[PDB]
Copies of this chain bind each other. A is one copy, B any other.
Amino acid sequence: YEHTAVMPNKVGIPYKALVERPGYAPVHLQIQLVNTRIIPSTNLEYITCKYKTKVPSPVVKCCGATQCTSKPHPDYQCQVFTGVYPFMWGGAYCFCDTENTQMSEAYVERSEECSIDHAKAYKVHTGTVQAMVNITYGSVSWRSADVYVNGETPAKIGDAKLIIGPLSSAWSPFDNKVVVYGHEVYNYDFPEYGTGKAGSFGDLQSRTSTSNDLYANTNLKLQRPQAGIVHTPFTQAPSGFERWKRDKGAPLNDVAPFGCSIALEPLRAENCAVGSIPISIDIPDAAFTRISETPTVSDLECKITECTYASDFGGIATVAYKSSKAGNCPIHSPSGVAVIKENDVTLAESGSFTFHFSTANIHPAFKLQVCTSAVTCKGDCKPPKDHIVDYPAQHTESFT
């Protein structure tokens, strides 16, 4: 029945698989994965970003004790200081003769960089997660299907229902707690919400990028005004999204498990290249090519017509095909070690039809799964090589 693909997940490369179907004729795949997303039922705990000591304006009651009024930004460092004698033009702005108090207040406030090029924490749960694998079958058609956990939301994206395992993105490569810095996503703790203090990335907790309320301790320290005269000393130390960029965790857009990269995301895993994606689909007859084309492909033999030593597509091999009934026959190597560019290859009884492929060596004895019949296209060729070129079109690879 189902859409066989046992052939790995990559990205860049136009990599392929072959659907073993016996009720209908098999169908070729080009499994082009380059979009992968997670997206669970989640909750945004706080945007984070480094401080900006946008020195607030205190309600200085002046001398005889000063009381610090609660400003619309929760959590604030405020410290009375006496022994001042204010000046701001002329004289004191406090009501003692020179026994004046200056109540310095400084809270951490959202930076202008918080708005754009910032960090963003998440508690990442599961509720809506998706394993996304596009297959442009090529023999048939496109489908970019997803998986969904919540059942008031369709998982019938694509042609029908497509099941991945090892999943292509229904896991998170990052932890439950994740901090983010541009490209580099660090799967690293942060302190819950509404409690955060310095010594972590998430010490700043603004509920939005540019906010009105936040939780403001990033190791902001008021100290005694200089010269026994008014003003606000704000001593500010490093914080989340300043450090942890060289105190860094694992920078997932270059080190993600499941071969992915990550960025500022509502929780997604771009560009995955997981161990393998064994794709299995519950699809009608439309996703397959019909049995009338060939009930079973009866006889065939393959040999080169000059091949490649490379997983560039240029390898060719005639195949003296034969079939129970003549028609189309989608093809691809059933290991994907030869990645076949032919969506369909024609079969007539005792004819011969060349197909296109990419292999990886001078003697390409790769099976070709000619819609219910395998065949080795052996023969000596000339060796072209080029093996810096992107992720396998020979996938499942670990050979020459």
| Partner-B contacts on A (CB < 8 A) | 41, 43, 123, 125, 127-128, 149-153, 190-197, 205, 215
Bound-state Cα–Cα, A307 to B347, Å: 108
Bound-state Cα–Cα, A191 to B149, Å: 8
Bound-state Cα–Cα, A152 to B193, Å: 6
- B41 near A128 with CB under 8 A, answer no
A-B residue pairs in contact (CB < 8 Å), sample of 20: A41-B43, A41-B123, A127-B191, A127-B192, A128-B192, A149-B191, A150-B191, A150-B192, A150-B194, A151-B191, A151-B194, A152-B190, A152-B193, A152-B194, A152-B195, A152-B196, A152-B197, A152-B215, A153-B192, A153-B195
Bound-state Cα–Cα, A128 to B195, Å: 13
Bound-state Cα–Cα, A191 to B154, Å: 12
- A151 near B192 with CB under 8 A, answer yes
> How close is A205's CB to chain B, nearest CB, in angstroms?
8
> How close is A136's CB to chain B, nearest CB, in angstroms?
28
A149 to B, closest residue via Cβ? B191
CB contacts (< 8 Å) of A193 on chain B: these are 152
> How close is A97's CB to chain B, nearest CB, in angstroms?
36
| Consensus secondary structure, chain A interface | loop
Bound-state Cα–Cα, A81 to B269, Å: 48
> How close is A153's CB to chain B, nearest CB, in angstroms?
5
A190 to B, closest residue via Cβ? B152
Closest 4 CB pairs of A and B: A152-B194, A150-B191, A153-B194, A150-B192
CB contacts (< 8 Å) of A123 on chain B: these are 41
Bound-state Cα–Cα, A195 to B156, Å: 14
A194 to B, closest residue via Cβ? B152
> How close is A214's CB to chain B, nearest CB, in angstroms?
12
Of B152, B192, B215, which contacts A41 at CB under 8 A? B192
CB contacts (< 8 Å) of A125 on chain B: these are 43
CB contacts (< 8 Å) of A153 on chain B: these are 192, 194-195
A197 to B, closest residue via Cβ? B152
> How close is A21's CB to chain B, nearest CB, in angstroms?
32
A153 to B, closest residue via Cβ? B194
**New A-B contacts (16) at CB < 8 Å, excluding given A43-B125, A152-B205:** A41-B123, A41-B192, A127-B191, A127-B192, A149-B191, A150-B191, A151-B191, A151-B192, A151-B194, A152-B190, A152-B192, A152-B195, A152-B197, A152-B215, A153-B194, A153-B195
> How close is A197's CB to chain B, nearest CB, in angstroms?
8
A205 to B, closest residue via Cβ? B152
- B43 near A152 with CB under 8 A, answer no
CB contacts (< 8 Å) of A191 on chain B: these are 127, 149-152
Bound-state Cα–Cα, A295 to B5, Å: 79
Bound-state Cα–Cα, A152 to B198, Å: 12
> How close is A203's CB to chain B, nearest CB, in angstroms?
12
> How close is A44's CB to chain B, nearest CB, in angstroms?
12
A193 to B, closest residue via Cβ? B152
A43 to B, closest residue via Cβ? B125
A46 to B, closest residue via Cβ? B152
Of B41, B149, B151, B195, which contacts A151 at CB under 8 A? B195
CB contacts (< 8 Å) of A197 on chain B: these are 152
Bound-state Cα–Cα, A150 to B127, Å: 21
Bound-state Cα–Cα, A194 to B149, Å: 12
A125 to B, closest residue via Cβ? B43
A191 to B, closest residue via Cβ? B150
> How close is A42's CB to chain B, nearest CB, in angstroms?
10
CB contacts (< 8 Å) of A194 on chain B: these are 150-153
Bound-state Cα–Cα, A197 to B152, Å: 8
CB contacts (< 8 Å) of A127 on chain B: these are 191-192
Bound-state Cα–Cα, A43 to B43, Å: 10
